Design an enzyme around this catalytic site. Structure first.
Site, PDB file in Angstrom:
ATOM      1  N   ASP B  41       0.972  -1.200   0.002  1.00 27.55           N
ATOM      2  CA  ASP B  41      -0.185  -0.225  -0.074  1.00 27.55           C
ATOM      3  C   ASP B  41       0.854   1.396  -0.015  1.00 27.55           C
ATOM      4  O   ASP B  41       0.376   2.474  -0.440  1.00 27.55           O
ATOM      5  CB  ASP B  41      -0.895  -0.032   1.277  1.00 27.55           C
ATOM      6  CG  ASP B  41      -2.313  -0.863   0.923  1.00 27.55           C
ATOM      7  OD1 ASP B  41      -2.697  -0.348  -0.083  1.00 27.55           O
ATOM      8  OD2 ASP B  41      -2.732  -1.345   1.651  1.00 27.55           O
ATOM      9  N   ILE B  44       1.800   2.186  -3.634  1.00 24.91           N
ATOM     10  CA  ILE B  44       0.583   2.494  -4.430  1.00 24.91           C
ATOM     11  C   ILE B  44       0.132   3.961  -4.009  1.00 24.91           C
ATOM     12  O   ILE B  44      -0.251   4.060  -2.922  1.00 24.91           O
ATOM     13  CB  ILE B  44      -0.402   1.430  -4.286  1.00 24.91           C
ATOM     14  CG1 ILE B  44       0.029   0.145  -4.846  1.00 24.91           C
ATOM     15  CG2 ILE B  44      -1.662   2.029  -5.055  1.00 24.91           C
ATOM     16  CD1 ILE B  44      -0.837  -0.901  -4.490  1.00 24.91           C
ATOM     17  N   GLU B  80      -6.507   1.425   0.671  1.00 25.74           N
ATOM     18  CA  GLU B  80      -6.051   2.546   1.349  1.00 25.74           C
ATOM     19  C   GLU B  80      -6.112   3.887   0.170  1.00 25.74           C
ATOM     20  O   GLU B  80      -5.169   3.392  -0.969  1.00 25.74           O
ATOM     21  CB  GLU B  80      -4.591   2.681   1.732  1.00 25.74           C
ATOM     22  CG  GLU B  80      -4.193   1.587   2.619  1.00 25.74           C
ATOM     23  CD  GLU B  80      -4.069   1.966   4.219  1.00 25.74           C
ATOM     24  OE1 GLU B  80      -3.194   2.926   4.384  1.00 25.74           O
ATOM     25  OE2 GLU B  80      -4.626   1.226   4.854  1.00 25.74           O
ATOM     26  N   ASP B  82      -4.824   7.428  -1.266  1.00 25.97           N
ATOM     27  CA  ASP B  82      -3.867   8.353  -0.711  1.00 25.97           C
ATOM     28  C   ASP B  82      -4.594   9.858  -0.990  1.00 25.97           C
ATOM     29  O   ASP B  82      -4.357  10.731  -0.401  1.00 25.97           O
ATOM     30  CB  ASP B  82      -2.768   7.981  -1.374  1.00 25.97           C
ATOM     31  CG  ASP B  82      -2.115   6.751  -1.157  1.00 25.97           C
ATOM     32  OD1 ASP B  82      -1.567   6.501   0.241  1.00 25.97           O
ATOM     33  OD2 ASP B  82      -2.189   6.106  -1.863  1.00 25.97           O
ATOM     34  N   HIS B 126     -13.395  10.210 -18.060  1.00 23.98           N
ATOM     35  CA  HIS B 126     -13.929  10.409 -19.420  1.00 23.98           C
ATOM     36  C   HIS B 126     -12.409  11.022 -20.027  1.00 23.98           C
ATOM     37  O   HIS B 126     -11.832  11.220 -19.107  1.00 23.98           O
ATOM     38  CB  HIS B 126     -15.260  11.588 -19.156  1.00 23.98           C
ATOM     39  CG  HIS B 126     -16.293  10.727 -18.574  1.00 23.98           C
ATOM     40  ND1 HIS B 126     -16.891   9.767 -18.854  1.00 23.98           N
ATOM     41  CD2 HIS B 126     -16.688  10.794 -17.044  1.00 23.98           C
ATOM     42  CE1 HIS B 126     -17.936   9.125 -17.999  1.00 23.98           C
ATOM     43  NE2 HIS B 126     -17.527   9.843 -16.863  1.00 23.98           N
ATOM     44  N   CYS B 168     -11.761   6.971 -23.436  1.00 27.84           N
ATOM     45  CA  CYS B 168     -12.220   7.147 -24.712  1.00 27.84           C
ATOM     46  C   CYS B 168     -11.133   7.822 -25.624  1.00 27.84           C
ATOM     47  O   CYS B 168     -10.565   8.877 -24.956  1.00 27.84           O
ATOM     48  CB  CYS B 168     -13.547   7.850 -24.906  1.00 27.84           C
ATOM     49  SG  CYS B 168     -15.062   7.120 -24.510  1.00 27.84           S
ATOM     50  N   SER B 194     -17.328   5.544 -28.803  1.00 26.07           N
ATOM     51  CA  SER B 194     -18.843   4.843 -28.330  1.00 26.07           C
ATOM     52  C   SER B 194     -18.419   4.691 -26.822  1.00 26.07           C
ATOM     53  O   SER B 194     -17.376   3.783 -26.716  1.00 26.07           O
ATOM     54  CB  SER B 194     -19.161   3.859 -29.349  1.00 26.07           C
ATOM     55  OG  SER B 194     -18.157   2.763 -29.295  1.00 26.07           O
ATOM     56  N   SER B 196     -19.810   2.302 -23.735  1.00 27.98           N
ATOM     57  CA  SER B 196     -20.677   1.323 -23.416  1.00 27.98           C
ATOM     58  C   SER B 196     -21.488   1.685 -22.187  1.00 27.98           C
ATOM     59  O   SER B 196     -21.090   2.507 -21.393  1.00 27.98           O
ATOM     60  CB  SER B 196     -19.922  -0.130 -22.997  1.00 27.98           C
ATOM     61  OG  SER B 196     -20.739  -0.888 -22.355  1.00 27.98           O
TER      62      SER B 196
END
Ligand SMILES: *[C@@H]1O[C@H](CO)[C@@H](O[C@@H]2O[C@H](CO)[C@@H](O[C@@H]3O[C@H](CO)[C@@H](O)[C@H](O)[C@@H]3O)[C@H](O)[C@H]2NC(C)=O)[C@H](O)[C@H]1NC(C)=O
Ligand SMILES: *[C@@H]1O[C@H](CO)[C@@H](O)[C@H](O)[C@H]1NC(C)=O
Ligand SMILES: *[C@@H]1O[C@H](CO)[C@@H](O)[C@H](O)[C@H]1NC(C)=O
Ligand SMILES: [Ca+2]
Lengths: 527, 330, 155, 243
Positions: B41, B44, B80, B82, B126, B168, B194, B196
C-alpha cells in the site's frame, strides 16, 4: 510490560429499537512520549507514538463519522462526533508556533488515516475560547494551544477503516477486532472511527503521566435495515462473524450488553449465552446494568466455543420507553432564496425542574456573512441573554466566523438561537467540482452538564468499563455531554462557469465604448 | 531478468458523481490485482475522485463490484486511498509524478521512486482526443503527461514505466511520449468514442469499462510467482470482446515485451540475496483532569460586556474643529 | 405534526371555510448513511372530502418499503397535509421558517434538510387507467424539465 | 560504480552495481519483530539495550555518511507471503530461494505509514515462526539451510527467521516467554546493513591481512570509500538536477 491493552465492546439497545455497538481499544503506556527517545514501540502504535514527540501534542482527537447521532430518538451517546472528519488537538506549552505545527500534523494525519486532512486550512481551523477542554490531565487549559477543525463533507469508508485497523495491536486478526467487517459496519445508520490520545495518570494517586490511546468505533444498527424480523440481535447477525479466541495482548477483553428496562426494576433483557457477571452502574444519568462476557475466560470462550451473544430487543411500546435525554438540538437553515438566510438551531431542555447552562459553538465558513446584530436567543418566547458571548468575525478566505455562547436553558422548553447570514458570491475558481450541490456549514457543538437521574459515584478509570471513562466527570450529579447538530447544506449563488472569456470581452467592450465616446469628444474638433 | 527493485504504482480515477462508478471500479480492479500480486500500500498512490464504494447511494455499502454476479469485490477489506474527492486534481496528479508536491505532504501521498523503480500508471475517466477530464472540470493533455514523464526520466525516478489508460480515444494520451523506457496500453484508439452503457439492475450505475474487466480477469489467474509476460497482456482484450481496439505502444522500451513479466509492473518480486556475512559483535502533588464545562470560570474569563462609546479624545477633537471651521467662515 | 390556522379574507364561497385550522402530519425517513442534509418530499394533499384515501395508503406503503433500504442519500418526507393547499403552504412556510403568507402554525419539531424534489401524489381510486402529471406552479413557475423527463421515462 | 551507475556504459554487470543504497542525508532503520501468534509465543526482545550496545556504535561509525534514525517496533499477527513447505524427513519447515522474493509483501503492507521522514527506510524484520511451522529454515540454493537464517533485499531491509527451542512444558500450550538473543540477531542485521550500504568484504590483494573485525563493526578506510562514492554520486546528481 510497561504498556497494556484492554479491548471492550458495549452493546446498547437504543430506545428507538436500534442497537448501537461501541468498540474501545485502550492502550496505556507508562512512557515519556512527550519528548524524543521513545523509539521502541510494542503495543502503542509507532505511527501515532512518533507524533506526540515530533509535533508537541498533549491530546489528539480525530474522528471520522458518517451519519448523525439522533439524540432525541436514540439515547445520549457514550461519545459523539460530528459528521465528516473532526480533529482537535491540544499542543504543549513549548511549541511557539501553533499554526505551523497544526498544518504539519494535519498533513501527517491525512497521510496516516488516508483522509483529506490536508484540506484543514486557516478557513476551517477554529480556536475555541473554552469549549473543547482537554480530556486528560491538564496543568492549565490555555486555549492558545487548542486547534479545532472539522470537514463535514469527508467520507469515511474502509479507506479510513483499514489504516485505523492497522493501528490495533491485534490488527483485525484475533480477539474483539474480528467483528470489524467493513460491509457490516457501514450497513448502518451511524458509524464513528475516533482515535484519542491523552496524558492519563499512572496509578491510583495521579502524580505521574502515562499516555493513553483510545481507538473507538461507535456504530448503530438500524432495526428495519439490519433486523427487519423476529430474529434475535446476535453478534452474527450484526457483524456477520461470531467471537473466536480473544486478543492475547489484551490485559482485559470484555463485551458489555446493556440489559436495562424502564418502567421496570427487574426483568432485564434476555441474552442467550449466560454472561460471566453483571455490572450495574450509573453510566450517563441512569442506573443501567450490563451483562459482561469476559473473553479472557476459558469457561466463556474455549478454543472451540465461539461466542455469539444474542439480544432479544425490539422497539418497545411507547408506554415503556425513556422519554427523551434532557437535551437535544436541531439545526436548520431559514429562508428559501439565495443572498440571504438564517442559521437557527433549536436546543431543547426537556427536564421539567432544572435549568442548565449549555455552551454552543458555531463555525460558519466566511461565505455566509453573519450579521451578529441579528443574533436572537428566545428560549421561552422571551429573550434570553447569553451568560458568555464570544464572536470572532470572518476575514474572506482566511478565517471563519466563530460564535461561542453560554445559554442557560430555562426549563422544559425550546431555545431558538438564530442568526441571519447573507450568501456570498465567490470566484468561479472557488467552487467545488460539484458547485450546485452546495456548501457545508459545519455541525455546531453543544457542550452541557446535563443533570443525572441518579447521582453517580467517583470511580477510577481502571476498574470502570471503557465507556464510563471517556469524560472526566467533575460534579457527580451532572454528567457532561457534547452534542453535535446536523451539517447544514447551504447553496451559494453561482457564476456561469462556461463564460469566463466572454465576460472579459463584454466588460472590456463597455469600457471600450466609453473610451471611444470620450476620445471622439475630447479630441475631435467640430467642423 | 529485469533490474528494477521497487515496483511503485499510481492508480488514478478522475471521475465523481456515482454514475462514473465504472471508473472507480476500473481503478479498484487494477488496485486489487496489483496489491494481490505484491505491491504494498505504501508504494501505491491510489486516487479515487469519489468514493462510490460506500457513498449513501450504494445499495451494497463498502463494496465495489466488477460483475453483475457481485462475487468479486474489488474494494476489499484491505484498501488505502492516498488522494480522494477534491484532492484528485490534475494539479495534484502532476505534482505527484513530477515530485513538486508541497513540502508537508507525507510519504504515502507521494511517488518516492528511484532509478531502480518500476512504475505502473493507470489513468481512467472521461477522456477525449489527447486529453483526460479530471472530475468534469479540468484537463490533462497528452503534452503535459509526456512532459511530466520526461521530467521523471530526467531525474531517473523510474527504471521502466508501464502506462495504461482506460478512457475514450485513449491511444492518443500516450501519442506524445519521449521518455526512453515507457510502454503504454490503451482501451481505445485515436477515434472510437462509443462509450458502453449496461447498468446493473442491482447496482443502479455501470460496473466497468469492459477493457480493465478483461485485464482484471487476465490478472486474476496469475500468482505472484507467475512467468506470464507483456506479450500475453498485449492481446488480453480482442476486437470481438471490447468494441474498441486496445492499442499498445513499445517504441521506447529497450527490453523485448515477450521477456517483460507482467509481475514486473503488477506486483513486486523482490531481488533476494542470502546473507552469509556476520559482524561478530564483541558483546509529589497530584494531577487533575480539566473541568469540561467550568461555567463560573468561563463567564469571568471575558471582560464585562459594556456598551461601546467613542473616546473622549475623538469627541473633544472632532467637536473642537467643528467649532473652529464655524469661526474661519464667521 | 404541525398545527396551522389561517384567517381567510372572506369565506371563499367554494369550501365554506373562513377560519381555516388543521394539522399537517409528516414522517421523515432518515437516510441512514447520510447526515440528513438533503431531502425528498412525498406529499398527499388530503382535503375535506373522501378523495386521496388511496394516495395516503400508497404513501404509507411506499414508506414501509423505503424504510428498510440502506441506499438513501436523502431523507424522504412523507407529508399528509390537512387541506388541499393551505396545509401545504403552512408546512412549507414553517419548514423554511418564513412567513410569506402570514399564516400561523406551531414550531416544527423536526426537519429533514434542504428539500431537493417534491412529489404530490393525488389518487382517490384503487385501480387507475392513466396517470395525469401536472407541472405548472404558483406565479407561472415551472419545475426543472428533468423531473418531467424522469416521470415520462418511468412511465 | 554504484556512485556513477549512469555515466559508465552498461553491460552484464550493471544491476548488482546499482544494488546498494542511494545517497541521502538520512536513513531510517526500523527493527521490526514479527510475532504471528502471540497465543503461543510471548516474545520479548531487549531492543533498547541491543541498539545502544551494538547498533549505535555501528551507526556512529557509519554516521560520517549521513544521519540515522533507528527505531523499533513489534508487529503482532504479521504473516509471511508464502507458506513454508513441511519436510517429512526432519520435522522442520523450509523456504526455498524461489519463494523468498514473495515472502515479505504482507508484512511490508504493515510497515507502511509508520515512518516520520522522507528518508529511505531500511526495515529489518525478526520473524518468529508460529508453532504451525516453528522450526522454519531458509535454503540457500539447493537444500542446504542457510547459516544465519536470513536474507536481504538490495535497497530494502533484511529479514531474519529466529527459531525458539527447548520450550517443553507439562500442561497444554501457554504463551512461552521467548527471550531474543540480541547479539545473534544484531550480528546478521549489521552485516545486512553493511551490505545494503555497499561495503562488501575487503576484496584483498593476493597477500595481506586485516586485523580482524573492529569493535564498531566496519573499518575506517571502508568509511572513506563510502564518502568517496557519496561525494561523486552527490555531485553527479546535483549536476544532472541543475541541467
Ligand atoms: C406570520 O405573521 C402573522 C401576522 O401577520 C402571525 O399571525 C399572528 O399569530 C399570533 C399567534 O402567535 C396571533 O396572536 C393571537 O391572537 C389571539 C387573539 O388576539 C390571542 O388570543 C392569542 O393568545 C395570540 O396572541 C395574531 O393575532 C396573528 N396575527 C394576525 C394578523 O393574524 C403568524 O403567527 C406569523 N407566522 C408564524 C409562523 O408565527
Ligand atoms: C468450554 O469451557 C468450559 C470449561 O472448559 C466448559 O463450558 C466446557 O467444558 C468447554 N467446552 C464446551 C464445548 O463448552
Ligand atoms: C544530522 O545531525 C546533525 C547533528 O546535529 C545536524 O547538524 C544535521 O543537520 C543533521 N542532518 C540533517 C539533514 O538534518
Ligand atoms: Ca498508498
Amino acid at each position: 510490560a510497561r504498556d497494556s491493552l484492554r479491548e471492550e465492546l458495549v452493546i446498547t439497545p437504543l430506545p428507538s429499537g436500534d442497537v448501537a455497538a461501541t468498540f474501545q481499544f485502550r492502550t496505556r503506556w507508562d512512557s515519556e512520549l512527550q519528548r524524543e527517545g521513545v523509539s521502541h514501540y510494542r503495543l502503542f502504535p509507532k505511527a501515532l507514538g512518533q507524533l506526540i514527540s515530533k509535533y508537541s501534542l498533549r491530546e489528539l482527537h480525530l474522528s471520522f463519522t458518517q451519519g448523525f447521532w439522533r439524540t432525541r430518538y436514540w439515547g445520549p451517546p457514550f461519545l459523539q462526533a460530528p459528521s465528516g472528519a473532526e480533529l482537535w488537538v491540544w499542543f504543549q506549552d513549548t511549541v511557539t508556533d501553533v499554526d505551523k505545527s497544526w498544518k504539519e500534523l494535519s498533513n501527517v494525519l491525512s497521510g496516516i488515516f488516508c483522509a483529506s486532512l490536508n484540506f484543514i486550512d486557516s478557513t476551517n481551523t477554529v480556536t475555541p475560547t473554552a469549549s473543547f477542554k482537554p480530556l486528560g490531565l491538564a496543568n492549565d487549559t490555555d486555549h492558545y494551544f487548542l486547534r479545532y477543525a472539522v470537514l463535514p463533507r469527508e467520507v469515511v469508508c474502509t479507506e479510513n477503516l483499514t489504516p485505523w485497523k492497522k493501528l490495533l495491536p491485534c490488527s483485525s486478526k484475533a480477539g474483539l477486532s474480528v467483528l470489524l467487517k467493513a460491509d457490516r459496519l457501514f450497513h448502518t445508520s451511524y458509524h464513528s472511527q475516533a482515535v484519542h490520545i491523552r496524558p492519563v495518570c499512572r496509578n491510583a494517586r495521579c502524580t505521574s503521566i502515562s499516555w493513553e490511546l483510545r481507538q473507538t468505533l461507535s456504530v448503530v444498527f438500524d432495526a428495519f435495515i439490519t433486523g427487519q424480523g423476529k430474529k434475535d440481535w446476535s453478534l452474527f447477525r450484526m457483524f456477520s462473524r461470531t467471537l473466536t479466541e480473544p486478543c492475547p495482548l489484551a490485559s482485559e477483553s470484555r463485551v458489555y450488553v446493556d440489559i436495562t428496562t424502564y418502567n421496570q426494576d427487574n426483568e432485564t433483557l434476555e441474552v442467550h449465552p449466560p454472561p460471566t457477571t453483571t455490572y450495574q452502574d450509573v453510566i450517563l444519568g441512569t442506573r443501567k446494568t450490563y451483562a459482561i462476557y469476559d473473553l479472557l475466560d476459558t469457561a466463556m470462550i474455549n478454543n472451540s466455543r465461539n461466542l455469539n451473544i444474542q439480544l432479544k430487543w425490539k422497539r418497545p411500546p411507547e408506554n415503556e420507553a425513556p422519554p427523551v435525554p434532557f437535551l437535544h438540538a436541531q439545526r436548520y437553515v431559514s429562508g428559501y432564496g439565495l443572498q440571504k438566510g438564517e442559521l437557527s438551531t433549536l436546543l431543547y431542555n426537556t427536564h421539567p425542574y432544572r435549568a442548565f447552562p449549555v455552551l454552543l459553538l458555531d463555525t460558519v465558513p466566511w461565505y455566509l456573512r453573519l450579521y451578529v446584530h441579528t443574533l436572537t436567543i428566545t428560549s421561552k418566547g422571551k429573550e434570553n441573554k447569553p451568560s458568555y458571548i464570544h464572536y470572532q468575525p470572518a476575514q474572506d478566505r482566511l478565517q471563519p466566523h466563530l460564535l461561542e455562547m453560554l445559554i442557560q436553558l430555562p426549563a422544559n422548553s425550546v431555545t431558538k438561537v438564530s442568526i441571519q447570514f447573507e450568501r456570498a458570491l465567490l470566484k468561479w475558481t472557488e467552487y467545488t467540482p460539484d458547485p450546485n450541490h452546495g456548501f457545508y456549514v459545519s455541525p455546531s457543538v453543544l457542550s452541557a452538564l446535563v443533570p443525572s437521574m441518579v447521582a453517580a459515584k467517583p470511580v477510577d478509570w481502571e476498574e470502570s468499563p471503557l465507556f464510563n471513562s471517556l469524560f472526566p466527570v467533575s460534579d457527580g450529579s451532572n454528567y457532561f455531554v457534547r452534542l453535535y447538530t446536523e451539517p447544514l447544506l447551504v447553496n451559494l449563488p453561482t457564476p456561469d462557469f462556461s463564460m469566463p472569456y466572454n465576460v472579459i470581452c463584454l466588460t472590456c467592450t463597455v469600457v471600450a465604448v466609453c473610451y471611444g465616446s470620450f476620445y471622439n469628444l475630447l479630441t475631435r474638433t467640430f467642423h | 531478468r529485469s533490474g528494477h527493485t521497487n515496483n511503485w504504482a499510481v492508480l488514478v480515477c478522475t471521475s465523481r458523481f456515482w454514475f462514473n462508478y465504472r471508473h472507480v471500479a476500473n481503478t479498484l480492479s487494477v488496485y486489487r490485482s496489483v496489491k494481490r500480486l505484491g505491491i504494498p500500500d505504501s508504494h501505491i498512490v491510489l486516487m479515487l475522485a469519489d468514493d462510490m464504494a460506500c457513498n449513501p447511494r450504494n445499495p451494497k455499502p463498502a463494496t465495489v463490484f466488477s460483475h453483475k454476479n457481485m462475487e468479486l469485490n474489488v474494494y476489499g477489506d484491505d484498501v488505502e486511498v492516498d488522494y480522494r474527492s477534491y484532492e484528485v486534481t490534475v494539479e495534484n496528479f502532476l505534482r505527484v509524478l513530477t515530485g513538486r508536491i508541497p513540502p508537508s505532504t507525507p510519504r504515502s501521498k507521494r511517488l518516492l521512486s528511484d532509478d531502480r523503480s518500476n512504475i505502473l500508471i493507470y489513468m481512467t475517466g472521461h477522456g477525449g482526443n489527447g486529453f483526460l477530464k479530471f472530475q468534469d472540470s479540468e484537463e490533462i493533455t497528452n503534452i503535459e503527461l509526456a512532459d511530466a514523464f520526461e521530467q521523471m526520466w530526467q531525474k531517473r525516478r523510474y527504471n521502466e514505466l508501464l502506462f495504461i489508460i482506460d478512457t475514450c480515444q485513449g491511444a492518443s494520451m500516450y501519442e506524445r511520449f519521449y521518455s526512453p523506457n515507457i510502454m503504454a496500453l490503451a482501451s481505445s484508439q485515436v477515434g472510437e468514442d462509443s462509450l458502453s452503457h449496461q447498468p446493473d439492475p442491482a447496482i443502479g450505475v455501470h460496473l466497468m469499462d469492459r477493457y480493465t474487466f478483461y485485464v482484471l480477469e487476465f490478472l486474476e489467474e496469475i500468482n505472484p510467482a507467475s512467468q506470464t509476460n507483456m506479450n500475453d497482456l498485449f492481446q488480453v482484450c480482442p476486437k470481438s470482446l471490447c468494441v474498441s481496439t486496445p492499442g499498445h505502444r513499445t517504441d521506447l522500451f529497450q527490453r523485448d515485451p515477450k521477456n517483460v513479466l507482467i509481475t514486473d509492473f503488477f506486483g513486486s518480486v523482490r531481488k533476494v540475496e542470502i546473507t552469509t556475512e556476520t559482524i561478530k559483535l564483541q558483546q509529589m502533588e497530584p494531577l487533575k483532569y480539566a473541568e469540561q464545562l467550568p461555567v463560573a470560570q468561563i463567564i469571568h474569563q471575558k471582560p464585562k460586556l459594556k456598551d461601546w462609546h467613542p473616546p473622549g479624545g475623538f469627541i473633544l477633537g472632532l467637536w473642537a474643529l467643528i467649532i473652529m471651521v464655524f469661526f474661519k467662515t464667521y | 405534526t404541525q398545527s396551522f390556522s389561517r384567517k381567510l379574507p372572506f369565506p371563499d364561497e367554494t369550501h365554506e371555510r373562513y377560519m381555516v385550522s388543521g394539522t399537517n402530519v409528516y414522517g421523515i425517513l432518515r437516510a441512514p448513511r447520510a447526515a440528513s442534509t438533503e431531502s425528498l418530499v412525498l406529499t398527499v394533499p388530503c382535503g375535506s372530502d373522501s378523495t386521496n384515501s388511496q394516495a395516503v395508503g400508497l404513501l404509507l406503503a411506499l414508506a414501509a418499503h423505503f424504510r428498510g433500504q440502506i441506499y438513501w442519500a436523502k431523507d424522504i418526507v412523507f407529508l399528509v397535509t390537512e387541506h388541499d393547499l393551505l396545509g401545504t403552504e403552512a408546512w412549507l412556510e414553517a419548514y423554511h421558517d418564513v412567513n410569506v403568507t402570514g399564516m400561523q402554525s406551531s414550531p416544527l419539531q423536526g426537519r429533514a434538510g434542504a428539500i431537493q424534489a417534491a412529489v404530490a401524489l393525488e389518487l382517490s381510486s384503487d385501480v387507475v387507467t392513466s396517470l395525469d402529471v401536472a407541472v405548472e406552479g404558483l406565479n407561472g413557475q415551472l419545475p426543472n424539465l428533468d423531473l418531467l423527463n424522469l416521470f415520462q421515462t418511468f412511465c | 560504480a554504484a556512485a556513477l551507475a549512469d555515466h559508465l556504459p552498461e553491460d552484464k554487470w550493471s544491476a548488482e552495481k546499482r544494488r546498494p543504497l542511494k545517497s541521502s542525508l538520512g536513513y531510517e532503520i526500523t527493527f521490526s519483530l514479527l510475532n504471528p501468534d502471540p497465543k503461543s509465543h510471548d516474545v520479548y526482545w531487549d531492543i533498547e539495550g541491543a541498539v545502544r550496545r551494538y547498533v549505535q556504535p555501528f551507526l556512529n561509525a557509519l554516521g560520517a555518511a549521513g544521519n540515522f534514525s533507528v527505531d523499533s517496533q513489534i508487529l503482532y499477527y504479521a504473516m509471511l507471503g508464502v507458506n513454508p513447505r513441511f519436510d517429512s524427513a526432519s520435522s522442520s519447515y523450509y523456504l526455498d530461494m524461489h519463494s523468498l522474493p514473495h515472502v515479505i509483501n504482507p508484512v511490508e503492507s504493515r510497515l507502511g505509514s509508520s515512518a516520520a521522514s522522507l528518508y529511505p527506510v531500511l526495515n529489518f524484520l525478526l520473524y518468529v515462526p508460529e508453532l504451525a511451522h516453528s522450526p522454519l529454515y531458509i535454503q540457500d540454493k539447493d537444500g542446504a539451510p542457510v547459516a544465519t537464517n536470513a536474507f536481504h533485499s538490495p535497497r530494502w531491509g533484511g529479514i531474519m527467521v529466529y527459531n525458539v527451542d527447548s520450550k517443553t512444558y507439562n500442561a497444554s500450550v501457554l504463551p512461552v516467554r521467548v527471550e531474543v538473543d540480541m547479539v545473534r540477531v544484531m550480528e546478521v542485521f549489521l552485516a545486512q546493513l553493511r551490505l545494503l550500504f555497499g561495503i562488501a568484504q575487503p576484496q584483498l590483494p593476493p597477500k595481506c591481512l586485516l586485523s580482524g573485525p573492529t569493535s564498531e563493526g566496519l573499518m575506517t578506510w571502508e568509511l572513506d570509500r563510502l564518502l568517496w562514492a557519496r561525494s561523486v554520486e552527490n555531485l553527479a546528481t546535483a549536476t544532472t538536477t541543475l541541467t
